[PDB]
């Protein structure tokens, strides 16, 4: 799990079941079983559908009402998916789930859209799988 077979990234959300096996009176050893387990793991990973996962961030943006359409559109331009929207006495709160790869220099674009009147907070949420084009890019 420490070094994934495809791309070297850490394996996650995967479980295994040992149901059968063989041994030798003199030859069998703890090291031998560990290496056999490694061979089997690689073969199984190769045939199981291996997908890279991209970290997704829970992002909350406080924006003036006039620029909400612009901020929501920018988040949609990113592979980010909106999960919420709260109107507030001061500003409008927008909740979205955006991959961190997409969240680069977001503050610059956010400030250009809202006249530097919009602030955003983020927290790691989960590792949803990357889109195929981005995932192949990661493999390369």
């Amino acid at each position: 799990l420490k070094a994934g077979p495809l791309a070297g990234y850490p394996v996650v959300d995967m479980g295994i079941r040992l149901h059968f096996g063989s041994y030798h009176d003199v030859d069998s050893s703890e090291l031998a079983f560990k290496l056999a387990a490694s061979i089997a793991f690689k073969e199984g990973f190769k045939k199981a559908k291996p997908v890279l996962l991209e970290p997704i961030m829970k992002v909350e943006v406080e924006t003036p009402e006039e620029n909400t359409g612009d901020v929501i559109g920018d988040l949609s331009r990113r592979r980010g998916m909106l999960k919420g929207q709260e109107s507030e006495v001061t500003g409008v709160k927008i909740h979205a789930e955006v991959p961190l790869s997409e969240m680069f220099g977001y503050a610059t674009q956010l400030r250009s859209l809202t006249k530097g009147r919009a602030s955003y907070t983020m927290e790691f949420l989960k590792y949803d799988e990357a889109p195929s084009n981005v995932a192949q890019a990661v493999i390369e």
Binding site: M57, L100, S101, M122, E123, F124, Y127
Partner: peptide, 8 residues
Amino acid sequence: XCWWGXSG
């Protein structure tokens, strides 16, 4: 790998 809050 990607922001002050540590995380990927």
